[PDB]
Design a protein around this ligand. Sequence first.
Ligand SMILES: Cc1cc2nc3c(=O)[nH]c(=O)nc-3n(C[C@H](O)[C@H](O)[C@H](O)COP(=O)(O)O)c2cc1C
Ligand code: SF4
Ligand code: SF4
Ligand code: SF4
Ligand code: SF4
Ligand code: SF4
Ligand code: FES
Ligand code: FES
Lengths: 28, 108, 427, 207, 117, 230, 66
Amino acid sequence: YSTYTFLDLNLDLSKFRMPQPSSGRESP
Amino acid sequence: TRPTVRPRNDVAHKQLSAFGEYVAEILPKYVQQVQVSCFNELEICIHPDGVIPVLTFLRDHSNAQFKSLADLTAVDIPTRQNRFEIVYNLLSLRFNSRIRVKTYTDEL
Amino acid sequence: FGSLKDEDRIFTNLYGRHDWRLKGAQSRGDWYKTKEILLKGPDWILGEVKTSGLRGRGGAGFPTGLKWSFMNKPSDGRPKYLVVNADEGEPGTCKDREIIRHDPHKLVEGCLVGGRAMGARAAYIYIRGEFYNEASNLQVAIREAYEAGLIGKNACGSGYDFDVFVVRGAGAYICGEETALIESIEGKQGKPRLKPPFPADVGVFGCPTTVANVETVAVSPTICRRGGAWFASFGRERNSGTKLFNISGHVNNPCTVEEEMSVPLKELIEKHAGGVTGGWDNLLAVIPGGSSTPLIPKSVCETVLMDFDALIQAQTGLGTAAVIVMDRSTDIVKAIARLIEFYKHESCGQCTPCREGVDWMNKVMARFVRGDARPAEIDSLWEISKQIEGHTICALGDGAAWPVQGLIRHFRPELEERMQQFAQQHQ
Amino acid sequence: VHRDTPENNPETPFDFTPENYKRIEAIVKNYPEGHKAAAVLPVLDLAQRQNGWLPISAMNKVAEILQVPPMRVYEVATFYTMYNRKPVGKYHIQVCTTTPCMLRNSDSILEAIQKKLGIKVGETTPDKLFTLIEVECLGACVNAPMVQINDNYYEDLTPKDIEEIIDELKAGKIPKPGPRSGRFSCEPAGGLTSLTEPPKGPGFGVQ
Amino acid sequence: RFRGEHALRRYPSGEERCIACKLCEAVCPAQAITIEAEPRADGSRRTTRYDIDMTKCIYCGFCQEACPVDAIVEGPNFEFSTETHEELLYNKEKLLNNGDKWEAEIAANIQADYLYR
Amino acid sequence: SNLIEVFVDGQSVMVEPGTTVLQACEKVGMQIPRFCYHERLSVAGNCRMCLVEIEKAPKVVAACAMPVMKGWNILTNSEKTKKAREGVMEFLLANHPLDCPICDQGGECDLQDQSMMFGSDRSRFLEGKRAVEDKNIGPLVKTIMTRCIQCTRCIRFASEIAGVDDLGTTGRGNDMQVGTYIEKMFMSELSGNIIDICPVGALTSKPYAFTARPWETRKTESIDVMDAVG
Amino acid sequence: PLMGWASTADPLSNLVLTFSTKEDAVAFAEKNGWSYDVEERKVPKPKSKSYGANFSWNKRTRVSTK
Ligand SMILES: Cc1cc2nc3c(=O)[nH]c(=O)nc-3n(C[C@H](O)[C@H](O)[C@H](O)COP(=O)(O)O)c2cc1C
Ligand code: SF4
Ligand code: SF4
Ligand code: SF4
Ligand code: SF4
Ligand code: SF4
Ligand code: FES
Ligand code: FES
């Protein structure tokens, strides 16, 4: 119900822990 | 199937499948291919050694009159290794039947 | 079917609609026996859904116990991922947006649990952006217990412990079918793939993934918990389970409810609580599904149960499980033309049957509600409905003729007098 | 309507917030690298968040940020619904007319809005900031023909709320982000209780 | 429905009803038609050379029944018989002039016969 | 070795395990109609014209993008396939204007050599016919984007061999378009070589534009000498 | 020089026949006996085309913007 505070969604906890990732390569 | 499609029949397709069959049976000397058209016509492919006697056989009989010579034509066909194609067309008077005689040849 | 129930009790798959909707301390149902479920092998969980036989309540069968075990390679060289849908593409479903409203912790359990059946790497979930206030609570639930170290990357008891990421669309369509969402999560426009490449667990994002619905993995913890011989308690031998229902249209309380398989519509709709239209002695044209199940009139459908095959014994099945009626005030052809009007604004545009074939029907259905010229236009309209079933790709091609063809049945003078009245009006 | 840009603002320009450049690092760390390559759905949404409506130079800004061809940006924002290209207002409001919402008498939550406000159908306000359109398929047809706003939803719309939600927003209030009346949680109403208890002996998982 | 002299029609105030779609050429049995077209500077295509070999013309009239925009019309006037072979080859600036010695003769016969065909 | 005998109309032929139904049926000397397909391009399927009724199945599949399993009976002419090739090529012949007196591909368009052989007899639409607007790109490509049956064939060529990433798809549903959103010109090497690829006469040559129809020419093969590769 | 027609000499200039194959192609040019020259039939590659490999994990064969 708050239009802002997506950094609470994105950058607060999901940036502190991803984890890890390894994410593969796929360079290509 | 519908209107505006030609209604074919099977009675004339039966007897012309019947009549021309025993023609090759009684002269297996000259006849090399017989075929029935899907619209009641007949071809009797003949090597031209028997150009005279097969006509002479259809000249007279008691089961085949065929004395109305209507059409002599000539059709060329290149890429056949024997070019030309003499084709007759004769008519039975008493029986109302059409049959053609396809005889190939070459030039010389 | 059993004893025609399908009752409503507390022994369901819901924690509480009113208990606590924010983040909490996982009091009763959430995280009860956490490490003991994943300590068993996947072969304990593979085939455990066969004890349930959950067909998947998205609108089609092909049960989740089969698509997770079978059509699943072990590994070749590339990872696997999980796609848990959450968006509602059908009109008037509302089965979602209430699960995330008060039960955020239940879904996070079956994510790692259902992924353990596949052995996939991570968990990607997709929510509509327009459900914006409710989606903010979802990351708060990630802040509640996932950020409390309960999950990931070794919690608990084993090395298998992973994450969950949240994405949002804008105005999308890939709720309605899979293999477009795995395309749209890359960044392409959303024009879905062909259906047999290599289907979705062979050819996916860069590597084969799985796609499930909400309750395809939301009931997965508790069906692994209570088990039985209880998941097949209602219904016949074909279908099994207890699904959430939703009631709209003309009723005293348009609301959700909980029932199970094989309940007839005369007792199912009129209970909980009122039938505010003519509950009888009205027309009461019922719609069994969201949109792909057409009108059924006041005949024996009300005594026909809600089995998958019972509506297959009727003219059209329904797995979306939506209830809307049209009794007295609603004109029949007026409402359904607005349903056809709807599909112009959500068709993709790939298939030449779908594109330019829907707006064939759009321009003619607006001609019938107006009331217009001579008949036999109905049959030409009926042949177009008999011309788009299996030519397109997605089920929208099936979702475009089924409301039309079911209107051709059961209603011959729906407009045979109305369009004659306009023909009487000009004459 | 038409979907092109005949060159009014080719370069507005537009820049991002220094608070918002660091948020990209959370976004890029999500995707598997190499095939990451396109995070255009939250990012161009965040550009809509900073500006409100974005120009064509705002489209060209992010193309150098994520090394895609800039033609592959025009494909996205001209497809979806919530992205905007034309200039918009402060309050974007939506009448959720759907076919079961039609059955809940959407005609009442149709006009008597334009007469109340002074605008045209499907049209922005002539003054500043009210823009009114109509949408479909956002959850509850089980509620009234409800009203969507910029960050919430107004369940249980009614002609009193037509005299309220238009009225309170002209004054600058926040008219009840949810069900303003009736059932606050959309409960079964005769089955809303369902014997609220602990769920009958958890611990069946021997199996 | 009597056939005769060739002529060309045009719209209300002059437009060259011909669109040079070449169909009258491909069905002429004597190939009396020869047309070279070109984009005129306004943009719409028109003709440059337009010929009817009135010697060769065998009057199958299929040109009248092949034009979609109904351009060429067999005008019903048997006024003929010049004195050279060099004259009867009609160029374009006979035919528009010959189509504009009269039109009310032509425009009434089409309007009394177009319902049948 | 490494083959499956598939009875194409009840007649055996051995293909590689992993080829297409189109190349199988084209090997035995047949033509299935081709709109969303090209051999020298990639493979999509969004025209849905090739539809063959496979035996022992109630459904109909398209021969563009699917492999071939253990030997089927690819029933080419059926009493249902002709209920499909009539079917799809009735829709796309409606939302289209009445050109070809003036359409410059008027002797070779593939709505004109398919529509006699396949397809229906009359029309039942009977009003409609949306009409989009056109634009200009370069001084070589005469541009009528109205006709544009959206077979996605010029579109992939920008991602194909000519590597200029310039074109796209703008729109949804009935209303989508093909041209560039901005007025950027498109010209490089091979840039005039799209007007062969466009299978209808929506694209054509600018200097050639209004000259002559293609049933009067005399096709004589030769070689050009303006480069060393011939 | 009266119309600009393509009047001409070269009395043959339009003679195309329909042959069956390469075998009797030569045999007709020699049977009447004037000089000639023969091209060769070109059949293309079969070729290897397969959808599904247009979505890669590490390859280059990958389509976009469809
Ligand atoms: C008209 C229609 C609308 C649908 N809408 C959705 C939807 O909004 N969300 C969803 O997850 N599935 C929807 N589906 C079903 C999808 O096919 C389904 O999500 C996918 O096949 C996965 O099946 P599952 O529900 O068993 O997980 C819809 C199907 C139809 C026919
Ligand atoms: S039916 Fe056709 S246009 Fe609609 S989503 Fe499927 S492929 Fe796309
Ligand atoms: S009659 Fe028809 S084909 Fe002849 S010049 Fe006129 S438009 Fe062209
Ligand atoms: S008038 Fe006769 S000869 Fe002359 S173009 Fe017409 S059909 Fe041909
Ligand atoms: S130019 Fe026209 S025919 Fe060619 S791909 Fe584009 S839309 Fe299709
Ligand atoms: S391109 Fe095709 S549809 Fe268009 S005018 Fe030519 S033949 Fe007709
Ligand atoms: S569809 Fe209008 S709000 Fe649910
Ligand atoms: S021919 Fe291209 S999809 Fe059918």
